Amino acid sequence: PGECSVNVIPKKNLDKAKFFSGTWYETHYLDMDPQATEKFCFSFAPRESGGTVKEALYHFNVDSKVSFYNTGTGPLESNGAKYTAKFNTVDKKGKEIKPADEKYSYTVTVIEAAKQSALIHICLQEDGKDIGDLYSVLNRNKNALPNKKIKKALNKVSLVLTKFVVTKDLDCKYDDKFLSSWQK
Ligand code: HEM
Ligand SMILES: NCCc1c[nH]cn1
Numbered sequence: 001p002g003e004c005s006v007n008v009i010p011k012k013n014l015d016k017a018k019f020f021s022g023t024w025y026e027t028h029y030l031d032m033d034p035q036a037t038e039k040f041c042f043s044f045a046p047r048e049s050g051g052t053v054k055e056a057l058y059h060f061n062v063d064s065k066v067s068f069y070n071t072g073t074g075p076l077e078s079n080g081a082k083y084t085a086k087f088n089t090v091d092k093k094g095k096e097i098k099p100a101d102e103k104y105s106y107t108v109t110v111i112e113a114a115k116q117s118a119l120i121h122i123c124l125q126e127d128g129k130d131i132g133d134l135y136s137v138l139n140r141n142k143n144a145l146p147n148k149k150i151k152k153a154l155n156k157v158s159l160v161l162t163k164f165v166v167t168k169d170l171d172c173k174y175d176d177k178f179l180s181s182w183q184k
Pocket of ligand 1: 026028029038040041042044057059070072087104106108120122134135136
């Protein structure tokens with residue numbers, strides 16, 4: 001199965017205003033499907049208001065040199081560090097080019113955040129059933145290494161950073177303006 005990981009614990013008392021601001025770059029990622037070996041770059045701009053998350057997502061396929069843009073929207077859990085979103089497909093100007101498919105959703109858990117670093121987990125689902133998951137280390141700076149608090153969080157769940165794919169070595173292309181201008 002594409003069963004999502006157990007023991008994914010939301011950070012206690014995440015600072016929402018700090019986390020749900022600016023642009024986050026994935027610096028390391030671990031797709032829990034060992035055969036998912038396509039190289040990707042990822043960045044996003046998550047925002048929150050009134051218990052609803054609205055985020056802009058950017059992916060770049062290094063293997064194919066194709067980029068794609070999505071937006072996701074959903075309720076933030078009472079714990080304040082986990083949300084489940086439905087997503088559509090937009091172009092680089094933010095115009096919807098494909099509507100959200102009702103059967104798909106994803107659940108983001110913010111496991112840890114420290115300084116300019118964060119660690120999230122994403123469980124993808126179809127009709128409310130797991131179809132795969134991934135962990136990502138995030139940083140405000142593409143070239144930066146994670147704060148040690150991130151490693152501690154990985155270590156609590158028997159993961160080590162060396163298992164992760166490192167992105168700075170990849171030939172990434174980013175659309176930073178798409179994310180900078182999110183909700184502007
Ligand atoms: C951090 C490293 C990440 C990597 C390496 C990654 C990789 C991928 C890959 C390989 C796909 C499939 C693309 C294809 O079908 O051609 C994908 C799709 C997608 N991912 Fe990610 N992802 C990451 C993070 C995230 C995060 C954090 C979110 C949500 C907050 C997210 C949401 C999505 C969405 C909405 C799609 C489109 C699915 C569809 O079109 O059916 N991803 N990503
Ligand atoms: N194993 C989950 C893959 C993925 C891609 N994008 C988001 N999640």
